[PDB]
From Swiss-Prot:
Expressed in brain, heart, kidney, liver, pancreas, placenta and skeletal muscle. It comes from Homo sapiens (Human). Induction: During mitosis. The mRNA encoding this protein contains an internal ribosome entry site (IRES) in its 5'-UTR. This 5'-UTR generally suppresses translation while specifically promoting expression during mitosis, when cap-dependent translation may be impaired. It is found in: Nucleus. This is DNA cross-link repair 1A protein. Belongs to the DNA repair metallo-beta-lactamase (DRMBL) family. The gene is DCLRE1A. May be required for DNA interstrand cross-link repair. Also required for checkpoint mediated cell cycle arrest in early prophase in response to mitotic spindle poisons. Possesses beta-lactamase activity, catalyzing the hydrolysis of penicillin G and nitrocefin. Exhibits no activity towards other beta-lactam antibiotic classes including cephalosporins (cefotaxime) and carbapenems (imipenem).
Amino acid sequence: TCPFYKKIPGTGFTVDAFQYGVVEGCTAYFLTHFHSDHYAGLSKHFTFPVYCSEITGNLLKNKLHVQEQYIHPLPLDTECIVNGVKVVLLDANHCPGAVMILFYLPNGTVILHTGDFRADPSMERSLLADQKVHMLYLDTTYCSPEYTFPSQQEVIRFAINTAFEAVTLNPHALVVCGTYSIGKEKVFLAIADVLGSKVGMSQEKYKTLQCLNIPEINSLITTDMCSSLVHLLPMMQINFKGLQSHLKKCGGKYNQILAFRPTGWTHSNKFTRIADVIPQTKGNISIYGIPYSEHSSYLEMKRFVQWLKPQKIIPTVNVGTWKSRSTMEKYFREWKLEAGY
Ligand code: NI
């Protein structure tokens, strides 16, 4: 049944709750972003109002075939009224089209639902600065102090410099980047930019990217693999067998692969700096795991919460075990005693 952490009290609303059938008493279904564990259940047969960003609504129409009459896109950073309740959509710094949602309840309570987010100090100057938030529905994906990772900027500088050096040393090297969802487009786009190539990809992935309102996108991507020396493949194909196979397909145009796997966290992060990352190599194939995250690190999460000073926190990730729930509740209490709220 629908978990309580997907329901907004004092409303008929739910967030990211499309796999439970008809939720009794729900008048409006919000979708924070187009990742499968959040949209699970949606299709062309859905007939309730879906409220989302413009970019998520493009993906719902083009990829899932949801009918236009049930897609209700909202502009960001704008007070809107939905079924009698004031709401605002804010940029979540996750994947394209991802939002946080501010609910202003008729009784005076203010609720922030982060969806999935990567906390940033820029959020401290949005419309969130303008009033008090009482209850926080929080993306706790990496809520433990072991989870450190570098800035997205540091990670992209590493990838650009590695790719440019390899291809200038060997103009017959191919660059391959893994994907299984939207997000992390800077990794393959920044590398294609430094190399003077478009990124080549399947027709399915090209269709997906063309929904994302990315500026000048027709100049940066293509379905013609032969004209490209940056290829995108399913994340599943980023291993030695999959890559050896791909290289056979390119008909002796290339004699080396340099591949990137943009993982979330990996335990080489508790020890190793970005400067010190090395690949796994077999023969003429090398694979780099780069820690490019679209979720908050521990410290980023803690700073955002200590700034916001909510009265109550409701975690939305890692909720399925008692040890995980009790650990998170201990960190919330530490943060509150340190900051004095
Ligand atoms: Ni997500």
